[model samples]
Target: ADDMERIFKRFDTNGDGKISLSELTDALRTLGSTSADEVQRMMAEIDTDGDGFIDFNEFISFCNANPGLMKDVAKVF
Candidate 1:
């Protein structure tokens, strides 16, 4: 859980409590290459509130649903 917090902060950049689409896109690139459309698609599903940004709870929700992602995210960061 603590490690996940660290990873989230990495993506959150700017020390903001939420992750912006630009931040998410840039962060994902560290794991691998992806299209903006793909990132947008992920944001659509993960945002969960149509706010166009990912709050920490939403980030955790996505991580729980895709545990493997957290593994890689944790592994890399």
Candidate 2:
């Protein structure tokens, strides 16, 4: 959990207590992703609120609702 928190903090670039599209893409790129559009598409799918940013609560809930999605995301790392 601590590691996940740390990873979340690292991805939340604006420090606004959430991960924006840019932040999410940046994290994905850092993890060796070469496709920005793919990341954006994934973000669009996970961003339930359509607010262009993903709060930790939303992220957690999304993961709980879509466990396989998380595993697919982990492959980027």
Candidate 3:
């Protein structure tokens, strides 16, 4: 969780307690070589409030659902 704590901060660039699409897209592109469309698609399902951004709870739910992502992200950072 320590690693993810820092990683989340890295992505939460604005320090506004939410992760924006640009932040997530950049992280995905940097970590997984992903496409922006792919990120948008995933965000569509993951973002619960339809706010076009993810809050902390949504992010935690995602991490819990895909636990391996956090594990592997440690290696990247």
TM-score to true structure, per model: 0.87, 0.67, 0.79
Tens digits of per-residue lDDT for model 1, 1-77: 37778888788875778877688877777777765667778888888686988888888887789987888889876
Candidate 3 on 31-73: residue-level lDDT in tens? 8778778877777777778598877778766776887787787
What is the C-alpha local distance difference test score of each model? 0.80, 0.69, 0.74
**C-alpha RMSD for every candidate:** 1.3, 3.4, 1.9
Measured with C-alpha atoms, the lDDT of residue 65 in candidate 2 is 78
lDDT per residue, candidate 2, 1-77, as tens digits? 44346557766888888887678877777865646676667667677786777888776766667666556555543
Question: How many clashing pairs per prediction, in order?
Answer: 0, 0, 0
- Model 1 residue runs over 4 Å out of place are none
lDDT, model 2? 0.69
